[PDB]
Amino acid sequence: PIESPAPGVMDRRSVHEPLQTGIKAIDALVPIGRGQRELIIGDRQTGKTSVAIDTIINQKDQNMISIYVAIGQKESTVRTVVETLRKHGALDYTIVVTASASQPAPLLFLAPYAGVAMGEYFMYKGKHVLVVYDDLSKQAAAYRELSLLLRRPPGREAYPGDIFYLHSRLLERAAKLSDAKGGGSLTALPFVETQAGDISAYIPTNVISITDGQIFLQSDLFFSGVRPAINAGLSVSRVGGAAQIKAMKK
Amino acid sequence: QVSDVGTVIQVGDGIARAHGLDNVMSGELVEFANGVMGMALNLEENNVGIVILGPYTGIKEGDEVRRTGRIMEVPVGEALIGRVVNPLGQPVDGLGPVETTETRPIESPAPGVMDRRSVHEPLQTGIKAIDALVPIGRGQRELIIGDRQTGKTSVAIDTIINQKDQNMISIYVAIGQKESTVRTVVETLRKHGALDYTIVVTASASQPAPLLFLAPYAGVAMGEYFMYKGKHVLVVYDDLSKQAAAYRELSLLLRRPPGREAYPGDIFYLHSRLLERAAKLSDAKGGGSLTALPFVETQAGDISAYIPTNVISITDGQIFLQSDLFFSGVRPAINAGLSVSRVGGAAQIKAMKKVAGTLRLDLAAYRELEAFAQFGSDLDKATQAKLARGARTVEVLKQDLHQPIPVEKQVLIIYALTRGFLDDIPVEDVRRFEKEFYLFLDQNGQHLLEHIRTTKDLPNEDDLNKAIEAFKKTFVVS
Amino acid sequence: LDAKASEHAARMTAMKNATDNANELIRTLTLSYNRARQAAITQEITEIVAGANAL
Amino acid sequence: MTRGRVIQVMGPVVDVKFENGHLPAIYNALKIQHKARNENEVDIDLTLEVALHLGDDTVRTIAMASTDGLIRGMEVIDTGAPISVPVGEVTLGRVFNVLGEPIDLEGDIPADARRDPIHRPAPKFEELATEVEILETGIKVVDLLAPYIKGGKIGLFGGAGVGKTVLIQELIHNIAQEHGGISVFAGVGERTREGNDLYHEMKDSGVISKTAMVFGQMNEPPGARMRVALTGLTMAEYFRDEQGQDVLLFIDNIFRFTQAGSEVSALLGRMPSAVGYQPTLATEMGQLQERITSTAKGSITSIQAIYVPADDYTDPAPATTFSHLDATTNLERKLAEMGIYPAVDPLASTSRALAPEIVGEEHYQVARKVQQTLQRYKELQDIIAILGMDELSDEDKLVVHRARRIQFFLSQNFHVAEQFTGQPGSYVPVKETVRGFKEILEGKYDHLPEDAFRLVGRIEEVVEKAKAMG
Amino acid sequence: GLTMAEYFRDEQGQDVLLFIDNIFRFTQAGSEVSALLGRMPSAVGYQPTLATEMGQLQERITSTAKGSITSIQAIYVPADDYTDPAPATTFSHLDATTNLERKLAEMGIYPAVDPLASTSR
Amino acid sequence: GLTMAEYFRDEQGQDVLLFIDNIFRFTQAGSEVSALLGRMPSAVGYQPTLATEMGQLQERITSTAKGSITSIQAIYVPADDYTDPAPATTFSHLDATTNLERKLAEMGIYPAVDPLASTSRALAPEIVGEEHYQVARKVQQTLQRYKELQDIIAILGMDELSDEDKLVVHRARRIQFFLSQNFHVAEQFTGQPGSYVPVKETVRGFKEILEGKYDHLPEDAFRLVGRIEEVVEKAKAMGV
Ligand SMILES: Nc1ncnc2c1ncn2[C@@H]1O[C@H](COP(=O)(O)OP(=O)(O)OP(=O)(O)O)[C@@H](O)[C@H]1O
Ligand SMILES: Nc1ncnc2c1ncn2[C@@H]1O[C@H](COP(=O)(O)OP(=O)(O)OP(=O)(O)O)[C@@H](O)[C@H]1O
Ligand SMILES: Nc1ncnc2c1ncn2[C@@H]1O[C@H](COP(=O)(O)OP(=O)(O)OP(=O)(O)O)[C@@H](O)[C@H]1O
Ligand SMILES: [Mg+2]
Ligand SMILES: [Mg+2]
Ligand SMILES: [Mg+2]
C-alpha cells in the first residue's frame, strides 16, 4: 500500500553502519550512516543531483539497492541521468521513478510514497536500501495546488495546514530495524531547493525539523572554483560519527 | 411578456439585480424607471446584474427596468468641440443640448499590427525642456508622472494651449478632480482660446465609481472618430491612478478575488486596453493619429509602485517631475535624467536635433558636480566652466505659467546657450536676456525665423552669430 | 605644513570610504526591508481570500 | 446532436448547456455564429475553449475575443477537437492571430490545408535524445562562453537599445543558412507598435521569408494571450516532428503568459496562490516548456525574454521560469556605447553546457582562461584610477595588453548589420574561434595593433586587417 | 454638520466656517460600517467605497454665487505614515495643508507648524 | 502524559518532573484539524480557539498545596518567526524562558541562548542575592551596548570608537564567548567531556571578567569551557 504505518519505537536500532558516499567532503566531516535520513539543501545549479548520482554510483561494491525518485524534473535531465547510471553500471541495482513537470499535480504528489513503498519491500527482508527524492519542494507545490483546487483554506505562504504532516509521514518510514525485525534499513536523501540561500524559509525549516541533519551547498562557493560547494558552517550530521569507521573518526 | 422588461430584486452600493430581460445583450444599456442609465454586465441564469450609472438612491426593489437595444456607446461628432460633458455624453455646462447624429461604442478593438505606421511627426508641447530633452511624436503615448502639486496639470494645459495653429484636436479627461478645479481649468482654456478645438470630459469625485471607471474610454471613443477620418488628436487622462481606484472599488463590490497589492487581477489589462487604442495609422487608413498623455501620481516619489510600474511597462516613455526641484524654484521641475522618450527623437526636427545634444550633455554634467557644491573652486575647467554653463542651462530651461513659445525661438535660444553667447552674462540676468532676445528677434530676425519655419533646419551659422552679436551690442546687463 | 596637508588628505579619504560603506549598508538594509514587505502583502491577501471563501 | 445553447455570460466566461451524453471534451473548441434578426442584435463570430464540466450537462468555457452582444439562448456548435492552426510550408512568411487566421493582406489559407491541435501531451521518455548536443550558432561570444543546447531554453536579458532584436535576426539568419532550419516568433502580451516595427525590420533584413509570426498582443483578451505561445509552439513542432529539422522559437515575454493564466484563473474562480498567482502555475509552465525538447529526429530550441517584477528574482513567476532555463545571455549598455557588438557581457552570461564532459577539455580550458583574464582586468581597472597606469607591474601590463585584444576580438560583424555598417557578416565555426582565442592567449599576436581586432570574423582576418593598416 | 452649515449660504447668502474635528475618525467609522455590512476590505482593511465617501463629503463644501463655505479640517497620521489611505485620499481635496511636528512642540515653538512641509495654492 | 503526572501530584503528594518534547505540535495538529470541523480561519490560518484550547491544557500543569510539578517544555518556533501566534500566546503561561537563536548557533557558541531575550521571574535581589543580581544586570548592560555599537562598528570601523567603547567591545566579546559551555551530552559530537559549573563559580568568574582581570587573554580561550580556571589553562596551552 501507498500509506503504511512507520516502524515503532521498539522496532528501531541506533544507526551504527557507515554509508560510504565516495565523496571526501561528505565522508570526512559529515558522515552518513545506514538508516539515517540526511537533507541535501541548496540553490539551483549547485550540484545537488551530482552528489546523489555520485553516491548511487559508489554503492556498486556494497550490498545496497538504490531508488532514485525524480519529482518535477525535466525529462531530458532524467534521461541523461539514466544514461550516466547505465554507463557506470548502477542499473544493476537501481530503480528509477519519474514524474516530470508535464504530469498532473497528483502524480507529483504521489511519487515519493511510491518510492518509499518500493523500498520497504527490500527493507523488511533484511536488506539495505537507499532512496533519493530529487525535490520535496516541488511535491509541496503540487500538494498546495491540489489543496487550493479542493478549496481548503491556506496557511502560511498559501501552504495548507498539513504540509508538515505530508513530509513527516513520508520521511518517518526511513529507519534502522533491529535484530528482532530483521536488521534491514532504509536511507533517505531528500532535496530542498532554497531561494537565495534563505535557510529560514517555511519549507526548509519544516524539512530540517524532520531529518537527522543537513548538508548545505552554497552557490557562492560553487561559483569561483569550490566545486563540491560544501559549507561546513551549516552542515552537520546529528546521528553520524557513531557510524564512521575508526580510522576516519580517529 | 418579460422579454423586454424586468423588475429589480436587489439594490446596493450602485449594483442592482433584476429578474427578467430575457433578450438583453451582454454589455447593453438599460433604462430604469426614474431615468437613470445602467449596464447589463453579468447575464446569469435566472437574473441580470446591472451597474448603475447615476444616483441610485431613487431605485427601489420592484421598479421596472426597460431595455434599449444598444450596446453602450457615446455620441461623437464635431458638435462636441468646445463643450464640457460627462462620460455618457450629457452636457454639464448648460448652453442647451449637444446636437449630434453619430455614435461609437465605448469598447472597440485597437488598430491592428498591420494598420500602423512608424511615428515621424513632431508634437510641439511649447515647453523648452520637453521639446529639447524628451521629444514627443504624433501617435506616441507618453507617461507623465510625479507627486502632488508638481505641475503635471500645468504641463498638460500648456501643451493643449500651444496647439492653436496646429491641425490638432485636444481632449481633456478629468477623473476624480474637484468640480471647482475642472471649472478653473475650463476658464483658463476659454481665456486662452483653446475651447475652439478642445473637448472636456469630466467625472468628479462625487460621481459613482463606474462613471470614473468609464470616463477615459469615452474620451478615447470620442478621439477615435476624428482619428479614423484622417485627423490628429491629443488625449489627456488626468488620473489613471484614480481610474484604477474606482475599478478596484467596483471589482470589490462585485466580490471578485483580490490580487497583488490589493488591486484586482486584470488591473494591467485595464490600462493595456485603454492605451493600446492610441496609434499612428498608416497611409492606407488615412494618415490619422491619436496621441495620449496618461498621468500617474506617486507616493513620495516612489517609482517602484505597482501602478507606475505597469504604466511604464505599457507606454513608450516617461516624464518624471521632482518635488524637490519644484520646491527649489525650478517650476517645470522636469528631471531629464530619469525622463526618456523611446519613439521620439525620430520626430524631432533637424534644427532642434543639431543642438539638443550639447544641452543634454551640459545638463547631465551639472547634476553630479552639484554634490561637490560645499567647496567652490577646485578647477577652472571642472568648477568654473561646467558649473557656470550648467547654471545658465538651468536658468534658460525655466519657464513661466501658461506661456508657450514657438519651436524656432526655442531653437535659436538653445543655440545661443550652447555656442557660448551666454558665457559672459550673469546668471541672474539670463531670463531678461532671453525675453529681450525674443523681442529683438521679432523686431529684426524675421528672415531667420521664416527660414527655420520653412526648412526645419538651422540657418547660416555666421549670420546667426552676427545677429546674436548685434543683439548683445544693445542688451544692457544690470 | 606637510603634516597638516597630510591630515587633510587622510580625513578626506576616511570620510569618503566611510560614506561608501554607509551607502552599501543602506542598500542592503533597504533591499531587505523590501523583500520582507511582500510577505505581509501576500499574508493579508490570503486572509481576505480565506475570509471571503469561508462564508 | 452536437448543438448547445448559451445560458450564462459573465465577461470572458461563458456557460453552455448541451444534450445529455453529448458534452464536448476538455479544451475543445466551440463556435458561435449569429446574424442580427432585427435592430436589437449584432452579428457575432466567436470561438470558445472548454475549461470545466460544471455538471447538469453544463460546460464552462473561455472566450478568445470580446463577449459583447451575446444573448442567453444563442446556438453553439461543437468542433470535436481543440483549436487547430495550419502548419507546413504555407505558414512561412505569414502572420497569425492565435486562431490560425492570417493578419496580413496576402489572403486566406485554403480549407484543404493540414491543421494540428493546439493541445498535445509532451513527447514520451522513449522519444527523447540520449546525448546532449551543442547548437553551433556561429557567433564567437555565444559559442565560446555561453554555448547553446539543442532542445534547451535560453533566457535573454538587456536594456532598451542594446541589440536584442538585431541579435535575434542574426541568429535566425545563421541557423537558416548553416543548419538548414527555420524560426518561429511568438509575441506574447507586448506592444503592437513593437510588433509592427519587428515585422518591418525582418522584411528589411530579408529574414522574413524563413520565419512565421504570431502576435496576440497586449490588447487581446486573456484567453488569447494564454494560447498564443501554444499556437506558435504547435506550428514550430511540425517541422521537427515531420521534417527532422532544427528550429528556433522566440517568445517575446514569457511573464505575460503567466499573468494571462492568473487572470484566467481568477475568472474561473479558483483560490489564489501565494502572491495571487494561479494554483496551477507550475503545471502550466511545465506543460508549455516540456514540449520544447530534442527528439530522436530533431530538436526545438527556444530563446525567451523574461520580465522580472520589481527586480525580485525570488518572485514565484521568475522562480518557476528559471528552473527550466539552460543558459543565459546578458547585454551591456556599457559595451554597446563602447562600440562592441553584439555587446554580450562575457562575465554575466552563464550556461549549463560549458563543462568538460559536453564541450571538451580544450574548449573548457580556453574559455576559463579567458574569463580569468577578463576578471583580472576588471580588478585592475580600479587600481588604474587609484594609482595610475604606469604604476602597475609588468605582469599586470601584460594582462591588460592581452585583455584589450581579447575584449575586442569578442566582437563580430553580423550579416544583418550590413545595413548599418556597410560591411558583410561572418559565420565563425566553434573550432576556429577556439583556435583563435588560444592563439591570442599564447601571445602569438601581441605585436599587432589592438584596433585591428575591433570588429572582425576569424583570426586570419585580424592579421589581414593589421597588414592593411600597417 | 454640513447640512446645518449649508443653509446659511443657501437661504441667507452668508460666509460660513465649518470646522471638522478629525477626518481620520470619519474614515475609521466608514470602514467599521463596511466591515459590519460584510464587504470585501480594501488595501489595508479600509472600505472599497472610501474615495466615493470622501468625495460625497467634501464636494458639498464649495463656493457658489449666493455664498461660500470654507473648512478647516484636522487629520491624524498614524505612526507618521503619510502613505496611509485616509490621509492619502484626503490630500486630493485640500487647497492648503499644514504639518505639525512634535519635534517643534518639544522645543516649545507653538503652534509647531513646520515651515517647509506646509504648502498653499 | 499530564493525566499520568497529576495522579502522582494529587494522590501521593510527590514531586514530579514533567518533560514535554514539543508542545507546539499540539496546536499545529489542532490547526490541521480545525478546517475540517467547519470553523472560519483566524489570523495566519490558525483556529479561532487557539488561546482557549492551549489555556485549558496549560493551566492544568501547576503546583498545588498537596504536591509540586516542575515542567520543562520545548516550544518550536515556525520559520524563526517569534511573532507567530502559537509562540506569542504561550509566553504568558511561563515563569522562565530561554530563547535560542540561529545567529548564535551559527557562530558556534552553544547552547546559543539569547542573553537578552531570556527572562525569569526569579531574577530579583531578594531571591538570588545582591551580588548575583548586580553581576547579571551589568553583563546584560554590556551586551546591550555591544549590540547597539554594531552599526557604527560596521560603517566607521573599530578605530574611531572612543576609549570607553573599545573597552566595552573588548569585555563584551569575551563575555559572549564565556557564556558558552561544554555539555555532557555533546560528547558525541566532540571529544571534550563536558562540565558542571556551580552558581558561585559562574558569578565569581563573570565578576572577575567584568573587573578587567583577564583582559590580557585571547578571545578564543573563552570558548567552550567550564569554570574560569579552565580559561587560564586553555590560554597557557595556547602559550599566552
Ligand atoms: N564535482 C563537480 N565537478 C565539476 N562539475 C560539477 C561537479 N558537480 C556538479 N558540477 C556541474 O554543476 C552543474 C549543475 O550540477 P547539478 O545538475 O548536479 O545541479 P543541481 O543543483 O541538481 O541543479 P538543478 O537546479 O538544475 O537541478 C553541471 O554543469 C555539472 O557538470
Ligand atoms: N511653471 C510654473 N510657474 C509657476 N507656477 C507654476 C508652474 N507650474 C506649476 N505652477 C504652480 O504650481 C502649482 C501646481 O499645480 P498643478 O495643478 O500644476 O499641479 P498637479 O501636479 O496637477 O497637482 P494636484 O495633485 O494638486 O492636482 C499650482 O499652484 C501652479 O499654478
Ligand atoms: N551588430 C550591430 N552592428 C551595428 N549596429 C548595431 C549592431 N547591434 C546593434 N546596433 C545598433 O543598436 C541599435 C539597437 O538595435 P535593436 O533594435 O536590436 O536594439 P534593442 O536593444 O533590441 O532595442 P529595443 O529595446 O528598442 O527593442 C540598432 O538600431 C543599431 O543602430
Ligand atoms: Mg538537479
Ligand atoms: Mg492637477
Ligand atoms: Mg527589441
Author numbering:
A (entry chain B): 128 to 377
B (entry chain A): 24 to 501
C (entry chain G): 230 to 284
D (entry chain E): 1 to 470
E (entry chain D): 232 to 352
F (entry chain F): 232 to 471
From the primary publication:
F1 domain of ATP synthase is a rotary ATPase complex in which rotation of central γ-subunit proceeds in 120° steps against a surrounding α3β3 fueled by ATP hydrolysis. Upon dissociation from the Fo domain, the F1 domain can catalyze the reverse reaction, i.e. hydrolysis of ATP driven by rotation of the central γ subunit inside the cylinder comprising α3β3. The catalytic sites are located at interface between the α and β subunit in each catalytic dimer. Here we describe catalytic intermediates of the F1 domain in FoF1 synthase from Bacillus PS3 sp. during ATP mediated rotation captured using cryo-EM.
Two 120° structures were classified according to structural differences in αTβT. One 120° structure, termed step-waiting, has a more closed αTβT than the second, termed 120°. αTβT in 120° is almost identical to that of the 101° structure. The difference in αTβT between 120° and step-waiting is the result of movement of the CT domain of the αT subunit. Thus, sequential structural changes occur; a structural change from 101° to the 120° associated with the 19° rotation of the γ subunit, followed by closing of αTβT which occurs between 120° and step-waiting. Notably, the 19° step of the γ-subunit from the 101° to the 120° occurs independently of the catalytic cycle of ATP, such as Pi release and ATP hydrolysis in the F1 domain. At high [ATP], the F1 domain of 120° and step-waiting were composed of the αDβDHO with ADP and Pi bound, αTβT with ATP, and αEβE with ATP. The αDβD dimer in the 101° and 120° structures can be described as half open (αDβDHO). For instance, a comparison of the γ subunit in the 101° and 120° structures shows a slight structural difference.
